[PDB]
Ligand binder design. Sequence first.
Ligand SMILES: Nc1ncnc2c1ncn2[C@@H]1O[C@H](COP(=O)(O)OP(=O)(O)O)[C@@H](O)[C@H]1O
Ligand SMILES: CCOC(=O)C[C@@H]1C(=O)NCCN1Cc1ccc(C)cc1
Ligand SMILES: [Cl-]
Ligand SMILES: [Cl-]
Ligand SMILES: [Cl-]
Ligand SMILES: [Mg+2]
Ligand SMILES: [Mg+2]
Length: 265
Amino acid sequence: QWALEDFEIGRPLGKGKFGNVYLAREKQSKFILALKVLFKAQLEKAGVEHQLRREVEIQSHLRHPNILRLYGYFHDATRVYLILEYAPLGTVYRELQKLSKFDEQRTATYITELANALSYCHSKRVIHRDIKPENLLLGSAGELKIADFGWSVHAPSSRRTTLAGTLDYLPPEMIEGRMHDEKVDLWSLGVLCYEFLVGKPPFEANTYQETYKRISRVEFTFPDFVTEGARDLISRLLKHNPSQRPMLREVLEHPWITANSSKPS
Ligand SMILES: Nc1ncnc2c1ncn2[C@@H]1O[C@H](COP(=O)(O)OP(=O)(O)O)[C@@H](O)[C@H]1O
Ligand SMILES: CCOC(=O)C[C@@H]1C(=O)NCCN1Cc1ccc(C)cc1
Ligand SMILES: [Cl-]
Ligand SMILES: [Cl-]
Ligand SMILES: [Cl-]
Ligand SMILES: [Mg+2]
Ligand SMILES: [Mg+2]
């Protein structure tokens, strides 16, 4: 079906571990999209074919306004190409670098959009597991979109794959390699809410080793400017025991969320 010669390639949109992502236009229709390019050699050396397969399977069948579409894929002798919905306003990661911290209204609005998307996923027992600002994209109206489903799975689950870079968004049971479920994404939601308001993640440290210790002991503190309501929500999400973390419905109905968010459920 699709091949490289069907597209004109444009500027680089971003780079991940495996993904080299470019703007592109389909020649016959003039349809603008994002082409995520992957090198078969690297996919093989790291043995993550199964993650590539998860990404395509999951993200092509999901349909939600806060989840990035994957339209299809093709490959040649050396590369795999994923055909993605283009997100024109970039990453939440980039927006945070620009603004330093987000106000309560912006933050609550992003958390609602996240909770809506995750509620859709969890209803199929799909868990994302890699929710962080570089994987959160922005639509033409500034709406948040979850992307990069390569680490996703069906719960419950173990971990058969070596962890990559930062531990900053992972809960104790994932880093300790224990069994885990949907509640992992709730922990990550708590980390994100804190980082949006404060400008950095709550367990950040100088070394992998120290970050690990801070996560497993749940050692975090708040700057004076974080309000009582935000503190309440964040403290409920960052519980060591996953069974004690709230349901997404409880997040969406939290008074600090309903008081400050621009969007509904
Ligand atoms: N659809 C898209 N629209 C705009 N930018 C994108 C899109 N997809 C990815 N990017 C940019 O490319 C980066 C890497 O993409 P990602 O799919 O997260 O790669 P990896 O799987 O290697 O982490 C993202 O962090 C983002 O900056
Ligand atoms: C849906 C998962 O796969 C594809 O996206 C494309 C295509 C296919 O249809 N099945 C699997 C082999 N092939 C891709 C491939 C990827 C990586 C390496 C190292 C070799 C081959
Ligand atoms: Cl497993
Ligand atoms: Cl795994
Ligand atoms: Cl729920
Ligand atoms: Mg990524
Ligand atoms: Mg990936």
